[PDB]
From a paper:
Here, we report that c-di-GMP can assemble into a tetramer that mediates the effective dimerization of a transcription factor, BldD, which controls the progression of multicellular differentiation in sporulating actinomycete bacteria. BldD sits at the top of the regulatory cascade controlling development, serving to repress expression of sporulation genes during vegetative growth (den Hengst et al., 2010). Specifically, structural and biochemical analyses show that the second messenger c-di-GMP activates BldD DNA binding by driving a unique form of dimerization that is mediated by a tetrameric form of c-di-GMP.
Three S. venezuelae BldD C-domain-(c-di-GMP) structures and one S. coelicolor BldD C-domain-(c-di-GMP) structure were determined to resolutions of 1.95 Å, 2.33 Å, 1.75 Å, and 2.25 Å, respectively (see Extended Experimental Procedures and Tables S1 and S2). The BldD CTD uses a previously unseen mode of c-di-GMP binding in which two noninteracting CTDs are glued together by a c-di-GMP tetramer composed of two interlocked c-di-GMP dimers. Indeed, the closest approach of any Cα atoms of the two tethered CTDs is ∼10 Å. The BldD CTD interacts with c-di-GMP using two contiguous surface motifs, herein called motif 1 and motif 2, which are located between the two β-α-α repeats. Specifically, motif 2 from each CTD protomer combine to mediate contacts to one intercalated c-di-GMP dimer, Asp116 of motif 1 from each protomer combine to mediate contacts to the other c-di-GMP dimer, while Arg114 sits centrally and anchors both dimers. Arg114 is the only CTD residue that makes contacts to both intercalated c-di-GMP dimers. By sharp contrast, the BldD-bound tetrameric c-di-GMP is a tightly packed structure that is not secured by ions.
Author numbering:
A (entry chain B): 83 to 155
B (entry chain N): 83 to 161
């Protein structure tokens, strides 16, 4: 199920909560030279990486991304 | 050292030589829904995959793609 991230909502999620997601997204945009401001799709196994970054389980990370509306159900 | 395949050029290579590469590209394009039909950039690690499909070393495989005009000569530095 596509990990397609809304960078708009991402940009307005409280940092307190979303700073590591934003910095991860940013290193991918930089690697890619992909600077569109709207959407970032990322690899399925990048979910596992973000989960480590947040020290959460994938499933928890997922629910939290949905809740900020950065990912869709 | 980007691996960028030239699709127009690929389509001209005879199937008995380039067929496994053409099916690989079409499989990636399908997986992506990417039908620009001009260029296909692929992962560094996908060189390994094509080399396995061709039963060639990565060096041999890359030389072949350059000879077909499908990879620019850059790609040498990827192995
Ligand atoms: N997931 C995703 N990422 C996207 C999309 N559009 C653009 N990008 C990203 O944005 C970078 C720059 O895109 P571009 O310069 O406007 O424009 C491109 C594009 O015109 C062309 N290009 C190179 N390779 C490919 C390819 O495999 N497919 C397509 N459709 N275009 C490519 O070369 C430039 C740079 O390509 P890249 O190195 O791939 O780098 C791309 C890629 O990382 C998209 O629809 N989905
Ligand atoms: N810049 C960017 N746009 C994104 C991203 N995710 C989704 N999109 C948008 O959603 C469509 C499909 O993205 P996709 O699943 O990456 O699937 C894309 C992707 O696989 C590929 N693609 C398009 N442009 C590029 C490119 O510049 N470089 C590469 N490497 N692939 C590309 O073509 C497929 C279809 O592209 P489109 O339908 O025309 O247009 C896109 C694009 O408008 C993203 O991370 N970055
Ligand atoms: N080995 C290999 N497999 C490929 C390739 N292109 C597509 N696939 C497979 O096709 C899936 C969908 O690709 P996408 O629609 O462009 O959907 C892509 C896409 O938009 C984006 N994406 C992943 N990696 C890159 C990348 O290196 N550059 C760019 N610009 N976008 C990426 O995240 C998505 C989800 O990625 P995955 O979960 O890996 O999901 C990928 C992957 O399993 C390829 O060049 N090589
Ligand atoms: N549409 C589509 N294109 C794909 C996909 N996978 C690879 N590509 C294309 O192949 C190029 C090289 O992929 P790479 O060697 O994995 O080299 C990639 C890679 O190591 C890293 N990277 C980019 N996006 C992602 C991502 O979403 N996840 C991860 N884990 N790494 C990424 O940055 C490098 C440069 O990325 P780009 O300049 O976009 O350059 C990408 C791109 O144009 C895919 O799944 N979908």
């Amino acid at each position: 199920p596509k990990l397609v991230l809304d960078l708009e909502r991402m940009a307005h999620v409280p940092q307190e909560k979303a700073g590591p997601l934003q910095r991860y997204a940013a290193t991918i945009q930089s690697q890619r030279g992909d600077y569109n401001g709207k959407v970032l799709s990322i690899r399925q196994d990048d979910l596992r990486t973000l989960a480590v970054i947040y020290d959460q389980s994938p499933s928890v990370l997922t629910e939290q991304l949905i809740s900020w509306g950065v990912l869709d159900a």
